[PDB]
Each structure stands twice: as C-alpha cells, then as structure tokens.
C-alpha cells in the first residue's frame, strides 16, 4: 500500500484522459456569458477533479516529512495556482467584488500540460523569441527616432479646426462649442485645415484655429511623445494608416508626404523584413538540429454476375469520361446568377440531376467489381462515396432552410483533378500538413486564439454593455464588440488579419487605456508570432552595291554612336515628362497648351526617323528578332494611326479619341534603355510560367468559394433606403420589395439599391473575394452578408449572423493557404533561376556587382593601431585621459540624457517649461561642442580617418546653425516652417548610440547590401506608378467626389495622382478610390455636370476600365513588391552564413 498504492493511478493513460476531457468540458463552459444557476454544481465537480488529480500527485512523489513532490516542474505551479484560486472563493468572507474571474482561464492553459506534445512546441516558441532580442532593440530605436521627428514637425497640427467668424466668455467659451466648427457630411470628426498653401482649405467665412480635442477619440496626435509613439507603431503595422496619412497632410500640407514615404520605407518595409528574416532563420536551425539529432448458387452466381463488372473501367477512357463530367459540372454551376429567368433555371435544375445520376451510378458500378470492403481502402473512393451520399441527402429532402448550403457541397469533386494536375495536389498536401505533421502547432494556435477570446470577453465584456453610449449611435452594441464569445472571437481573428487599431479605440473608450493597451498589444505580439511560425513550418516542409551598301555603314555608325544613344534617352524622358502637364488646368493656360501640341509632332517625327535608321542599319531580319525593337515598333503604330487620322480628316470618332489615351504607354520605351529596368524585367518574365501554373490553381480554388457565395447570396444584398438621408429602412417599415414599391408609387423617397460589389455573378464574386482577401472593402461585404435575409426581402440586422464563418473559412483557406502555395513556388523558382545563370544574385547589373563585391569586403574587416599621438607635451597627458573608456562611456550616457529631454516636449506647454528646456539644450550644445573641439586640440593631425568622427563634427555644426541662425530668425527674414526642420538636426546625436551596438550593425549592414538590388526594382515600380498615374489622370479627373476621392486626394493633377498610386501600392484603401468609379449613370452620377471652362461634361465613371485599372495595378504591384521582400530577406541569409 502507501507509496506503492497511491502511485499506479498516476501512470495509466486512462488517468490522463479524464483530466483531458474535463478541461475541454470546462472550456465549453467558459464560453457562456452569464452562468446559469444550475451550472454551479458542475463548477464544483471541476474543482473536485482538479483537487483529486493533485491529490494523487502529492501522494505519489515523497512521503513521511520529505520536502514536497512536484515543486520543480513549471506546470505544477499552474496547478497549484488554479487550486488555491478555486478554493479562495469558498472561504466564507474573502471577496465580493472579484474582478479577477479572468484567472479562471489559467485552467485552460492546463491543456498544454495534459495533451502529449504541446510542451515541446510552446517551449520551442519561447526559444525563438530569444533570437528576436536584437531586432526588437532596433525596432524600438527606429520607432523612437521617427517618433521624435513627427513630434518636432507635427505638433498638435491635428487640432486645427475650421471655425466660423461669428455671423450673428470671449475665446475660451466661444472656441469650445463644437457647433462653431465645420463637419463634413456627418463625419463627427471636424475637418482639418491649414494656413499653409498645399494644405487643406476652409470654405468661405471660416478660418483655421488650433482648438479642439484630436481625431478619432482624442487618440491621434503628435503632442506628447507617447501618442506619437502609438501612431508610428500604427504606420509600421500599416493598419488604417492611410487615414493617418490623409489627416496629417490636410493640416500640415501636401509636401510632408516625404515624411510618410520615408517612414513607410524605413519602418513598414525594413522592420517587417528584418523581423520575418530572423524568425525564418531561427526556425531553419531548429528543424536542422532536430534532423541532425535524429541522424545521431449464391457465391457461385454472385461471382458469375461480378466477373462482368470487374471486366470494366480498367482500359477505356471511362475513368477519363468522369473528369470531363466534373469540369462540365463545375461550369454548369458557375453559370448560376441573379436574376435568371425560367427556361434557364430549368437547364440548371434538370442538369444537376444528370451529373448526380451518373456519379451515383458510377460508384454503384465501382463497388461491384472492386471487392467491398476493400473499396474503403484507397481514400479517394471513400471521398467519392461521401460526396455521393450528401448529394442524395440534399436531393432526398429539399426542405433544409436554411441548410441548403449542402448544394454547394457537390462543388467539392473538383479535387479529384489533383491526381493528374500536380499543382492542385501541392495545395492538398499543404492543407493536409496543417492537420497532420504540423498538427500540434495549429492546435496551439487554436488554444491561444481561444484563450485570448475568453480573456477579453471576461475583462471587457461587461464594460461594453454598461458603457454603450460612448461607442455607438443609439446606445446599443456596435458591430464589433465583446459581450459574448462569438463576437470576441471575431475581434481576436480581426487583429490577426491586421486590423487591431479601430477596435482598440473602442476598448480604451470603455475600459481605460492601460488595460486595453496591455491586452491588444499582447494579442498582436503573441498571436502574430504563432501565425508566422505556422506559416513558415508549412512552407519549409512542403518544398523541403557601290552606294547602297555604302549607305548601310553610315547609318550603322549613327545608331551605334555614343552621342546618338544619349540623344534618344533624352528624347524619351522629355516625351514622357510632357505627359505630366495634361491636367484639368491645361485648357486655361493657353501658352503651355500650344507648346504641348507642337511637341506632339516633334516627338513623333523623331521616333519615326530614328526607327527608319534602325531599319537601314539592321535590316528586317535583325530588327524583327529583337523583342525590345518589337516594343518600340508597336508604340510608333499608335502614334502613326492617330496622326494619319488627324491628317485625313477623322478627327473625332469612338476609336480615334480613345487611342489618345494610349500615350501613357510611351514611358515603356525607357525599359530597354536602362540596365536597371532590363535586368528586373528579365528576371520577372523568366519566372512567369511558374506563376501561371499557380494562378490557375488560385482561380480554380477561388472558383469554389465564389460559386458557394452565389448560392448563399445573389439577390439578398438589395435594400430600400431613404435617399434624402441614405439610411436603410426598418423591417417594421419596409419588409420586402413589395412594401417599398408601394412607397415609390406613393411618391416617397425610396430606392431598391444594391451593394455594387456583391455576389450576383461569379465574376462579381471574384471581385468580392479580392476585397476580402486583402482586407480592404471586406467590412461592407460582410455587413451585407450577415444582414442577408432572402431574395426580395429587406435585410435585417445580423439576422444571418453565422455567415461570418463563411468569411473566416475563406481567409483561412483562400488567403492563408493560397498565399502559402504562391510564396513556395516563387522561392523554388528563385533557387533554380539563380542556379541556371551559373550563378549569383539576380536583380543586380554587371557594374552594380563590382560595387557590391568590394563593399562586402569593406564591411567585414577592421584596421589595427591608428595611434600616432600628440607626442610629448601637456597635450599627451590630456590624450591619456580622453582616450580612456571613462571618457568614452560618459558621452554615451549623456546622449541618453539628451534623448530623455526631447521626449518631455508637449504641445501647449508652459513658458517656464520652455525656458528650462532651452537652458538645458543650451548646456548640451556647449557640452557637445566642447567634446568635439577638445578632440581637435588633443588629436591635431587627422581627426577624420574613421567615419564616426566625421559624423560627429557635422552634427555639432548643424545644431549650432539651429541656434546661431535662430537669432537671425528673430532679427531678420523669417519662416517658422524652416525653424521646425533645422531643429531636427539634434536627432542626429541619437544615432551615435549605434556606435557600440554590434548586432544592430549586422542588421544595418546587410540592410545596406540590398540597396543596389532594391534600387533596380524600385525603378521598375516607379515606371509602373508613372504609367498608371497618366491613365488615371486622363480618365478619372472628373469622377464624382464620393468615398475616397475628395478635393485634396484625387486624380485631377499629376501631383494628386502620384500620392494616390503610392497609397494603393501598399494596397491601403484601394476600395475607396474604386467605389466612385463603379458609378455609371443616374441616380448616382450626372452625365451633364458642365464644369467650366472645359468641353468635358459629366461626373460619371467607367466601371469597366476602373475594374481593369485597380485590379491590374493590385496584381502587378503584388508581384514586384514580393520580389522586394525576396531580394532583401535572402541578403540576410548571406551574412549569417559566412559568419
């Protein structure tokens, strides 16, 4: 007995199973928001089982006054914590309030302790955070240096409001009304304005004054370094950043985009490269060390009737006749749409019985001659019989409502193509790998998302309902809240999709800033780390005549010359730069307009005359085999046709007026002229067959979700609105289309309106799923799906609530696994394209490698003993003390004291605070001048051998200029906007802290190694931005000022068009620019707006050329930016390899 007796129980797997299902039983009970009265005795059972499980474990280890037992394992501390908490609420009088019911989720962390294999994975993710320690010092350094730049430039600028000067307590009392400001179309956020020109204007009778709260809830500002640190972390995660972009340029001016282009490039690009490169480097040596470690007359006539069956489908193409009946069955289901008439639905409904009949007969005729139950042995035939069963269950009832989603479950036979099509099989192997060999890692991701959803629903769930009126319009819950488990799963799933900022404003407004900052930042640090490891583990396991000939030489010497190539490239850049001047204003100028019209002939007659020189110097055989001469041949033909129609007499026609829009192709002549653009194009077009075989899978795989979307939706996004206000009628007022047509005939203001990106077609379904896959536009589509009630009925709020699980499943499968198969094919083609060349480092040219192979030699070496001295004087004993580490470390500490005294600046601080901060910034300037002028006395001869002393001298001078010329600013010709900029020179002192940090310098050097290859790709992306800015400026300058197009950010001029194409290149808010362009006719737009003084009439858009504009720019910029990530992250593998 004794120890022997109470020990056996501990070892059996039967004892580890009832605890493992007790936790899973209780994890279901954490889901319930209000616990009922009857569940309380079940909560006592769970406390009894966990006591008994720790009773067998105290009685197994050591007895008779022998210390403890399991007081060494970190997981029995969690068991001791959860027992001592579960009884402390049963100690007569202990609590009452009990705000920490959120310690009841600690027993949901006991799943790690009891499920076999989850201690290894959680212990392998903490080990990988230890590798990230040196990146996270550089990220917090760069988000501080960039947060001090915006805190000097944009100080409260976000509090400019546009106040009216009184039409019919002076100052404080008048500027604090919130009705004296100007609100644009009910935005509840008080338009921003600037006194600067190229800033936002105010309408007539208003002026801009800094007085008010701040945007969004008070949470968006650059006044109090903590708030500037929040908004540059929001620019680093690119999370709705394009509202922060457009707020700031409206009140600072449109020339401060240079801050935003630099901070998206240094912060959102480089830091996301360096984080994802060091995680993938850490995981690469984890599975390497693991692999290395592992290295270290019944029967008679039954058979008579069978033989016949067997002697079939083993040689003719009757197993190939099924795969043509599947790809026909997919296409009949793809033709369903709304609204379709009868005699077309009759083809759809007779046709579905035909394929179902020959898929039920084909598996009946397969289980005759293949010996069941050795039929349920292959797996595909199990999969075949499962689809046939639910197809007859769907036909057998036809009463499911709304459970007819199963008529989309016959779309799942398309995966039978993965036997022959070998890229669809790679898609199934990745999805099956998450459930299989990486199954315990996606189980940890299941638990952490579950725990984060239970925690925030216990902390914040009661505060949302008791504080509704702060964050909502009619004192009810918002679309996104945490009052139950399902909505608090959807917030936690959102954060993992990149949208963590908008929900955090509504938490901080309702539960305080400290408790919502700690929770939501932990969700997006831990949760984005686990998704990133599950992404890489799926990736690295899956691909684990006397005069006639004598004129030929003369033309050849011309085209081969060095003064002729430099002439044409000069003529190419001016022909393309002349395209930038064709604004709305070009009719009003009347002097640059006629210069454009003479230049449109001179440019054309040069590129004709140089073309005929290329015919004579080459011949037709040499010229028509160069593909770059084919590109220059087609551009002349567009120029020849519109010239010879403007000379024959065909001035205006539907084609000839539309060929003039094809002058935006004229910048494509620059591709064959530069070696930077030519190398990158040759490396993208070389990978183009690999992309097409993946894009074929992605179009087949998103076809299944899109035919599923037409079945759920397609007719159910129609609604009536009061169009004098634009708000959706109630279900009590308008129930359906019949009630609304009753209003319109009664002369009300109603419109049966659709959503214009919807699921009526398969083709419009592809456009709906691309707003959902990118996370731009997906709020509007999901609010319509969840309200979708039925065809011809008014939508009701969240009636079809569980249709979020459609969008969750598409983001898991058609965005997380679709992107996982795409990245794995480009990287696999990158290693073969780098191998076929011999070979090395594509996207660099031949000159650009020799600048690279010597810069590599420079950054990995160091000199020895530069130390002459000041020889023998009083200066020598000065040189003894100043060279010491005591003088070295005391300057670094005193720069850290300078970094803290810049963080204490605040908008609207006191005058006595400004003086103290001036006299301390005086005595730092005299100290750092005295530190560098002392180097000149006691190190006379050089001082300028190494770079950090050259850097130290210039930073001192610009600080003095910011002090010395500032006294001339109060004496002479003044501009405060130049005072904000020259004062930014003392942030250069902060950069001297990098001098000692070795390991950040390794990150910064392999950063600077990729600047040659990233320059070549950034020119091919500036050329595509420039071409798409000329298409959009000519097409979209007159489009109505709806959602994303306003008086400030539009396609009117070339400056306006380039700040909109830079925005779409991150993909930010491309749904908002597309929305006014999908307007075609009235009631929406007006085809006769007559905006003087131009011949052009109308403010409508073209939906056909706008979908081709935005969708094609999203795809081209996706391929060229994902080569930027590959070119940089592979440089980070090249310096860790040689070290």
């Amino acid at each position: 007995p004794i120890r022997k007796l109470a020990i056996k129980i501990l070892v059996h797997s039967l004892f580890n199973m009832l605890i493992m299902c007790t936790i899973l039983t209780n994890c279901v009970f954490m889901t319930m928001s209000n616990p009922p009265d009857w569940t309380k005795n079940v909560e006592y059972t769970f406390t009894g089982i966990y006591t008994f499980e720790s009773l067998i474990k105290i009685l197994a280890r050591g007895f008779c006054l022998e210390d403890f037992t399991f007081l060494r394992d970190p997981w029995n501390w969690l068991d001791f914590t959860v027992i001592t908490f579960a009884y402390v609420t049963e100690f007569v009088d202990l609590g009452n309030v009990s705000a920490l019911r959120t310690f009841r989720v600690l027993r949901a962390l006991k799943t790690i302790s009891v499920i076999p294999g989850l201690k290894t994975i959680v212990g392998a993710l903490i080990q990988s955070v230890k590798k990230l320690s040196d990146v996270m010092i550089l990220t917090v350094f760069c988000l501080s240096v960039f947060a001090l730049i915006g805190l000097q430039l944009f100080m409260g600028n976000l509090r400019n409001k546009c106040l009216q000067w009184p039409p019919d307590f002076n100052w404080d009392e008048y500027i604090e009304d919130k009705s004296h400001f100007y609100f644009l179309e009910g935005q509840n956020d008080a338009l921003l304005c600037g006194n600067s020109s190229d800033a936002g204007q105010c309408p007539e009778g208003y002026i801009c004054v800094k007085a008010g709260r701040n945007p969004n809830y008070g949470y968006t500002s650059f006044d109090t370094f903590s708030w500037a640190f929040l908004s540059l972390f929001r620019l680093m995660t690119q999370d709705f950043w394009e509202n922060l972009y457009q707020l700031t340029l409206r009140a600072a001016g449109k020339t401060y985009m240079i801050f935003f282009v630099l901070v998206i490039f240094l912060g959102s690009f480089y830091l996301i490269n360096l984080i994802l490169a060091v995680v993938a480097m850490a995981y690469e040596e984890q599975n390497q060390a693991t692999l290395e470690e592992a290295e270290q007359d019944c029967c008679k006539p039954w058979l008579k009737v069978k033989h016949l069956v067997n002697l079939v489908v083993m040689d003719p193409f009757v197993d190939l006749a099924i795969t043509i009946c599947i790809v026909l069955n997919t296409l009949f289901m793809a033709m369903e749409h709304y609204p379709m008439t009868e005699q077309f639905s009759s083809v759809l409904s007779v046709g579905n019985l035909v394929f179902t009949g020959i898929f039920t007969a084909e598996m009946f005729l397969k289980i005759i001659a293949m010996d069941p139950y050795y039929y349920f042995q292959e797996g595909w035939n199990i999969f075949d019989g499962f689809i046939v069963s639910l197809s007859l269950m769907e036909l057998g009832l036809a009463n499911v409502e709304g459970l007819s989603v199963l008529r989309s479950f016959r779309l799942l036979r398309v995966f039978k193509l993965a036997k022959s099509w070998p890229t669809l099989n790679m898609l199934i192997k990745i999805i099956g790998n998450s459930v299989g060999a990486l199954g315990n890692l996606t189980l940890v991701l299941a638990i952490i998302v579950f725990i984060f959803a239970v925690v925030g629903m216990q902390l914040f769930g009661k505060s949302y309902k008791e504080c509704v009126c702060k964050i909502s319009n009619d004192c009810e819950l918002p679309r996104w809240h945490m009052h139950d488990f399902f909505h608090s799963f959807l917030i936690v799933f959102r954060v993992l999709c990149g949208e963590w900022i908008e929900t955090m404003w509504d938490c901080m407004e309702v539960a305080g800033q400290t408790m919502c900052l700690t929770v939501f930042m932990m969700v997006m640090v831990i949760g984005n780390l686990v998704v990133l490891n599950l992404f890489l583990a799926l990736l690295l396991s899956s691909f684990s005549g006397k005069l006639w000939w004598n004129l030929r030489k003369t033309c050849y010497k011309i085209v081969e010359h060095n003064w002729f190539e430099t002439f044409i490239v000069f003529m190419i850049l001016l022909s393309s730069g002349a395209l930038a001047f064709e604004d709305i204003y070009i009719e009003q100028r009347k002097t640059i307009k006629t210069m454009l019209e003479y230049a449109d002939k001179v440019f054309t007659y040069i590129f004709i005359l140089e073309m005929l020189l290329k015919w004579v110097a080459y011949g037709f055989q040499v010229y028509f085999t160069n593909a770059w001469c084919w590109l220059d041949f087609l551009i002349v033909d567009v120029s020849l046709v519109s010239l010879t129609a403007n000379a024959l007499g065909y001035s205006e026609l539907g084609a000839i007026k539309s060929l003039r829009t094809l002058r935006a192709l004229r910048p494509l002549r620059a591709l064959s002229r530069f070696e930077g653009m030519r190398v990158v194009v040759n490396a993208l077009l070389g990978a183009i067959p690999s992309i097409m075989n993946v894009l074929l899978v992605c179009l087949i795989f998103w076809l299944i979700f899109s035919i599923m979307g037409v079945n759920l939706f397609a007719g159910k996004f129609y609604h009536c609105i009061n169009y004098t206000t634009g708000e959706m009628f109630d279900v009590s007022v308008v129930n359906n289309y019949s009630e609304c047509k009753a209003l319109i005939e009664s002369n009300q203001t109603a419109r049966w309106k659709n959503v214009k990106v919807n699921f009526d077609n398969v083709g419009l379904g592809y456009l709906s799923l691309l707003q959902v896959a990118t996370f731009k536009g997906w709020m509007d589509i999901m609010y319509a799906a969840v309200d979708s009630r039925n065809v011809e009925l008014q939508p009701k709020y969240e009636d079809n609530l569980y249709m979020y699980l459609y969008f969750v499943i598409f983001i898991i499968f058609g965005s997380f696994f679709t992107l996982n198969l795409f990245i794995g094919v480009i990287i696999d083609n990158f290693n073969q394209q780098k191998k076929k060349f011999g070979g090395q480092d594509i996207f660099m040219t031949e000159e650009q490698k020799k600048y690279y192979n010597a810069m590599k030699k420079l950054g990995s070496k160091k000199p020895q003993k530069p130390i002459p001295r000041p020889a023998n004087k009083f200066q020598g004993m000065v040189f003894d003390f100043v060279t010491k580490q005591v003088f070295d470390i005391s300057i670094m500490i005193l720069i850290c004291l300078n970094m803290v005294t810049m963080m204490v600046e605040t908008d609207d601080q006191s005058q006595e605070m400004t003086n103290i901060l001036y006299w301390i910034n005086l005595v730092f300037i005299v100290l750092f001048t005295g530190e560098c002028v002392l180097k000149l006395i006691s190190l006379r001869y050089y001082y300028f051998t190494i770079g950090w002393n050259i850097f130290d001298f210039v930073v001192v001078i610009l600080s003095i200029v910011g002090m010395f010329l500032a006294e001339l600013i109060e004496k002479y010709f003044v501009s405060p906007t130049l005072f904000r900029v020259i004062r930014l020179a003392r942030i250069g002192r902060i950069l001297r802290l990098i001098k000692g940090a070795k390991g950040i310098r390794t990150l910064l050097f392999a950063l600077m190694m990729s600047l040659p290859a990233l320059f070549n790709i950034g020119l091919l992306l500036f050329l595509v931005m420039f071409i798409y800015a000329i298409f959009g400026m000519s097409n979209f300058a007159y489009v109505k000022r709806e959602v994303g197009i306003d008086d400030m950010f539009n396609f009117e001029t070339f400056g306006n068009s380039m700040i909109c194409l830079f925005q779409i290149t991150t993909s930010a808010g491309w749904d908002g620019l597309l929305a006014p362009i999908l307007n075609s006719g009235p009631p929406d737009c007006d085809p006769d707006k007559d905006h003087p003084g131009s011949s052009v009439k109308g403010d409508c858009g073209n939906p056909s050329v706008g979908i081709f504009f935005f969708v094609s720019y999203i795809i081209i910029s996706f391929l060229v930016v994902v080569n930027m990530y590959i070119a940089v992250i592979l440089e980070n593998f090249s310096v860790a390899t040689e070290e």
């Binding site: 918002p478 708000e727 709020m779 959602v1043």
Partner: peptide, 16 residues
C-alpha cells in the same frame, strides 16, 4: 440616425 457615408456610422450604428 447619422450619415451612412462615414466609416463610423457604419460600424457603430444600426441604421446603416
């Protein structure tokens, strides 16, 4: 209600 043309009246009202 409020104007459904703002991103906030979307997310935080029922009228839209």
């Amino acid at each position: 209600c409020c104007n459904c043309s703002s991103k906030w009246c979307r997310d935080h009202s029922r009228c839209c």
